[PDB]
């Protein structure tokens, strides 16, 4: 087992990943902003270390800081989270050369993934269905682009090769404006993210966002942990997500996992990843591949009971795979509402002292948050304070729950967006389930 881990993150997954290593008997090394010397991990870790002012470029995505802080304090191992450098395959590439372990993948897996034109490619070999496209990028040439767009089908979605966030994305409706609007998204994608590329895919109108867990050893074993819908966005940012994903065909679903897991296998994946997917009409369609562990990961351990970042550890640590796909049993349902320090209504961040925090609890209530009383949210970083997480026998069951926890919910000082989620889980349409990525907006949207 992994001596000692440095944790290269904050927030609710600093907190979350250290949860996991003390359970495992692992050392921690916290490392912090000037402006996050408050966090809550921060005391129930073995180590600590300021890394950088507030702003997060000065701070949690210098590389050079977080390496230092491993050196001085004997860490093994860097747990990189989500977001920051968690798929920025230089900081994986300069830990191993520094002779540190990498909770995650290959820096290669992480550049054959982060490039999302290669990506596609890589999974059209593994014979892993995709959205219909650009076979590669959308080329600058008039006349080659417009005659991709034309063979695919309005309308179409230019979409940036090394696109995050929900970001670097334009939808075109009409041939007139493919040229210019792919123009644009070129030059955005360039600052945004240093590379130009772009590629193009079918817009797809009615399709749920669909994804499968995996955990891979990088010793030849790959498993799935079932699926999740995170299909309620907004500005292509997930709000709510639930498992397994509600209304599926059996055998597409069970045709996906197979694939997966067998790629997994091929390109030699090692840690936790998400290949997401769009459904659409029964059928699945390979978009992108997350190679790190992501936000809402709680879903998927309520039903199948394994716990992922557990996983990660031991696959470092070099472990074999201990659990088989017979063993993976997905029972029950389960419910995450993204805990945002918003405005509910403009969305405008909500930086401040909660004067009284009081967390919902009972059967089927998990809560995943470094919220605390007395604890100032800073102005610098993402606006995600908690996860509320319901599970039950079914997904009647679980919304049930969700609204019984929301209800309960104190975050006293600062503004959330737990009315919006109140909303949400007593929508028609969402209670019925089986809404699409564009539903949520829609809906907003009314007003
Ligand atoms: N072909 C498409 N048609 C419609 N919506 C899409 C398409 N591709 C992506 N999206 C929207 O953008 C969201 C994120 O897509 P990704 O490809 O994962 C971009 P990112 O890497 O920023 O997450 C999807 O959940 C979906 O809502
Ligand atoms: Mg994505």
Request: charged letters at 25%; one cysteine or more.
């Given at each position: ?29 916290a ?16 180590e600590?270390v ?33 977001g ?13 050369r520094?002779?540190?372990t990498?909770v995650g ?14 990506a596609?490619?890589?999974?059209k ?13 959308l080329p ?17 979605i ?19 404006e493919l ?12 600052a ?8 193009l ?7 749920r ?23 309620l966005?907004?500005?292509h ?14 055998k ?7 694939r ?19 459904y ?8 992108e ?9 709680p879903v ?20 074999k ?6 063993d ?25 002292k909660?004067?009284?925090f009081h967390?919902?609890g ?8 470094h ?5 100032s949210?800073?102005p610098?970083?993402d ?37 919006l ?14 809404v ?5 907006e ?6």
């Amino acid at each position: 087992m992994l001596e000692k881990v440095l944790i290269a993150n904050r927030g609710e997954i600093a907190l979350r990943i250290l949860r996991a290593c003390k359970e495992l008997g692992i050392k921690t090394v916290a490392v912090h902003s000037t402006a996050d010397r408050e966090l809550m991990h921060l005391s129930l870790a073995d180590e600590s270390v300021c890394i950088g002012p507030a702003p997060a470029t000065q701070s949690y995505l210098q590389i050079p800081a977080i390496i230092a802080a491993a050196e001085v304090t004997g860490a093994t191992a860097i747990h990189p989270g989500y977001g920051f450098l968690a798929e920025n395959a230089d900081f994986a590439e300069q830990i191993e050369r520094s002779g540190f372990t990498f909770v995650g993948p290959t820096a290669e897996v992480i550049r054959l993934m982060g490039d999302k034109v290669s990506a596609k490619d890589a999974m059209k070999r593994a014979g892993v269905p995709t959205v219909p496209g650009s076979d590669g990028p959308l080329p600058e040439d008039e006349e080659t682009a417009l005659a991709i767009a034309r063979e695919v089908g309005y309308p179409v979605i230019i979409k940036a090769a090394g696109g995050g966030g929900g970001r670097g994305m334009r939808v075109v409706y009409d041939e007139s404006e493919l040229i210019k609007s792919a123009k644009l998204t070129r030059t955005e994608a360039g600052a945004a993210f240093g590379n130009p590329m772009v590629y193009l895919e079918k817009f797809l109108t009615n399709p749920r966002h669909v994804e499968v867990q995996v955990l891979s050893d990088g010793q030849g074993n790959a498993i799935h942990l079932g699926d999740r819908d995170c299909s309620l966005q907004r500005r292509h940012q997930k709000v709510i997500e639930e498992a397994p994903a509600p209304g599926i065909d059996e055998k597409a679903r069970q045709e996906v996992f197979a694939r997966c897991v067998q790629a997994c296998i091929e390109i030699g994946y090692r840690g936790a990843g998400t290949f997401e997917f769009l459904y659409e009409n029964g059928r699945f369609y390979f978009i992108e591949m997350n190679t790190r562990v992501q936000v809402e990961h709680p879903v998927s351990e309520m039903v199948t009971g394994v716990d992922i970042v557990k996983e990660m550890l031991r696959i470092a640590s070099g472990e074999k795979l201990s659990i088989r796909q017979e063993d993976v049993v997905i029972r029950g349902h389960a419910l995450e509402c993204r805990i945002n320090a918003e405005d509910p209504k403009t969305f405008m961040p909500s930086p401040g002292k909660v004067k009284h925090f009081h967390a919902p609890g009972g059967n089927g209530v998990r809560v995943d948050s470094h919220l605390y009383s007395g604890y100032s949210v800073p102005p610098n970083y993402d606006s995600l304070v908690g996860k509320v997480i319901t599970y039950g026998a079914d997904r009647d069951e679980a919304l049930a729950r969700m609204r019984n926890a929301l209800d309960e919910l104190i975050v006293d000082g600062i503004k959330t967006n737990t009315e919006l989620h109140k909303d949400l889980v007593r929508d028609a349409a969402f209670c019925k389930g089986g809404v699409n990525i564009h539903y949520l907006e829609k809906k907003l949207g009314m007003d």
